[PDB]
């Protein structure tokens, strides 16, 4: 048969060949029309039924793919279809497909609701067709001494003006600056000028929106905002303006705030994924106390039986017909890989360490799974809280990653609980402490159907913070705090959880990219925020790398060292400070991680008063210069110096080679961190850099 889908997969960056291009098609320019066909043909046309009169076009194959193209799509209504001529002389029909083109219009189609002076009032244009109302788009005017930060977690600059970006949630696993993509998008912005003044302004949806910042247009910011599938609309625009500080603010009290977090969350995170046994998450755990380098968290990704993410590898059990599980139920062998679970969770615990398991909201359904994974995906099916395709079956991953994977609806309550319940056991007869809740991007589809009613063009972007607000509630009613870790999100995941910055390479751009994701986040409001320091991908990172990474995290709100799966091959690619050290020849590694990780020890009552603080000022805590020292110009060639909390600027050295560092101190009189000399603010400052220094300044108060 020959199949054709208008919107196609639905890949935000990519276009599959079974489908239109542009998906919305617009009068005037080019439309793309692909299919495929289930088996081998030697002939595909396309009819296209116009009111008037019929066409027909000869598809060619491309790479079983077939396409065709209109150069100028003329602004009619018309009707079209399939027609294939199989190998053995076969004629193939496909269904009638609609086509109703679009067009800008300029007539008050909806109302943009905003105020502020900023709003161009002739700039709306509205794309509509016969069917409804798509998209729109209208200009801000920005001035030529404005700085633009926002929409995010960016991993590209940290001033967006000049780029053409959009906000959608998207897995881009690895080199996320390279592509200008972002697991952490939010339709908002602050715009600051040199004299110290801002003003913001929040697209209020979860549709996907775009953003020319003055790329084109040199004094405007152009915005375009998805309408959503069921196209008289109403565009709501919240605007803000004073100091940079009273912006964000004002976007928080409609996103929402950072929650409260205990003192543990701000000592060394340690995590591997090859740690997939309580003798090696033990042995780890053993060295870093034998080594005076002190964790206060282990995170275990690989702790699972594989397949349900909700069972200890080799535990055994009676299985279930997809119901939750209590602690009891379970029997762990001493030869198995974990022998005693609880066992080591009390024993970390009395040592001073929490413990956080990996989750994805995901539900494998594959050939080879094992009866209670398969039951368990059966029940979620019959329960309902499943993402559903427009016909009311259950929504199959479209990604690489988990292929044909369910998706838990977590957007009701009943939802999330039934998904959660599953998981009380860990946290109420275990006594984990939180949970690592990777994912979240796996929905593609305008036309999902979700329980709260809300369609996919809506809820996809709103998943990843429905899945992380869903752990923190199954945390807070076990009498803990909500600590999630998670790496994508949307407008609203301020207030649930901490953030990393998901994927990278053991690289120095990666290093670079990374310091820029934390201060954008930073400034949307993403307050407890970490990193894979030096990167978890590939070989171990080079000594220099790991040594400047590792004295900028302990500079950063969450302090992590990470790596990534790597069947267990050699050799080892653990990112622990000995591992780096013997794989790299470089034994000073362990003395430069006992000698940081003592230094943020002792800035553990600093990182906790600016906490405080943070939370009743709505400042971040990783800050971007302009909210304390927006009047002064020179800040923006420095983007990658930052302020930790009020009083200590930091300045990561990110090049190979240095031996000597360049700060830019703002007005005020500061103090070397490790020296105590004094130097003047309002110029450039050089300090050497052995590798037990990363500059750092205080201020004298
Ligand atoms: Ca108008
Ligand atoms: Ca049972
Ligand atoms: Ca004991
Ligand atoms: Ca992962
Ligand atoms: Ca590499
Ligand atoms: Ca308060």
Known sequence: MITHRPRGIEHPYARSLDQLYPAIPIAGQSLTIGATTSGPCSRMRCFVLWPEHEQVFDMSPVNNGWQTSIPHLPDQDATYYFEALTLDGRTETSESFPLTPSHWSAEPVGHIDIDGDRFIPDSPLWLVSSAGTHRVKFALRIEGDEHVVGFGERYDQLDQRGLRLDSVVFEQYKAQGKHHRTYLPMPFAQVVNEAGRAWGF????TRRTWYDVAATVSDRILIEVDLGFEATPVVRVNTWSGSPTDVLNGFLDVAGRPAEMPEWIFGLWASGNEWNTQSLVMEQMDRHRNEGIPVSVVVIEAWSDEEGFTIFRDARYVPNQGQPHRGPDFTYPSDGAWPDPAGMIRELHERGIRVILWQ?????????????????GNALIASGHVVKEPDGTPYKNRGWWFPNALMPDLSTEAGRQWWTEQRRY???????????????????????????????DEGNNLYPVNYARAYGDLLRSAGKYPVTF??????????????????????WEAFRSSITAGITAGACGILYWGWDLAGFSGPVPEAELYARAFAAATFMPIMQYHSEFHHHELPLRDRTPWNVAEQTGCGELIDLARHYTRVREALRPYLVAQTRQCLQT?????????????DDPEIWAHPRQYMLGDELLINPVTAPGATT????????????????????????????VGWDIIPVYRRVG
Request: charged share 30%.
């Open 202 to 205: 929040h697209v209020e949806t």
């Open 360 to 376: 994805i909201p995901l539900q494998k359904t594959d050939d080879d799974l094992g009866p209670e994974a398969l039951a368990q």
């Open 426 to 456: 860990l946290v109420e007869d275990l006594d984990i402490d939180g949970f690592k809740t990777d994912g979240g991007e796996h929905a593609w589809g305008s036309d999902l159907r979700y329980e709260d009613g809300r369609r996919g």
């Open 486 to 507: 998670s790496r994508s999100g949307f407008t609203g995941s301020q207030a649930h959880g901490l953030y990393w910055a998901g994927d990278e390479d053991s690289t």
């Open 618 to 630: 709505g400042k971040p805590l990783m800050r971007a210069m302009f909210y304390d020292h927006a």
């Open 661 to 688: 560092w360049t700060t830019y101190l703002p007005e005020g009189q500061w103090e070397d961190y490790w020296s105590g000399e004094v130097s003047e603010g309002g110029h450039l400052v050089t300090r050497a």
